Amino acid sequence: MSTKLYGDVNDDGKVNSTDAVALKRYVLRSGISINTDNADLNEDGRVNSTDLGILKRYILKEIDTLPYKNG
Ligand SMILES: [Ca+2]
Ligand SMILES: [Ca+2]
Numbered sequence: 001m002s003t004k005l006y007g008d009v010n011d012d013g014k015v016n017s018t019d020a021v022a023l024k025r026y027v028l029r030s031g032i033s034i035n036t037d038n039a040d041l042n043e044d045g046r047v048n049s050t051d052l053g054i055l056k057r058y059i060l061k062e063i064d065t066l067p068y069k070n071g
């Protein structure tokens with residue numbers, strides 16, 4: 001029907017400061033349940049700090065493609 005997300009945490013929109021709640025709970029331990037499927041995209045898990053940026057960069061609105069920018 002319709003799909004638009006990128007490594008969502010609570011399947012709300014995406015994994016960012018918004019889904020930090022679970023993040024903190026995650027970074028701490030792997031107890032909570034999140035769409036770990038496509039959650040991590042830098043072998044970090046979520047947004048250690050390197051991904052966050054881009055995330056908070058694209059998640060700003062670009063949320064749809066995400067300028068991963070390889071390099
Ligand atoms: Ca979300
Ligand atoms: Ca990551």
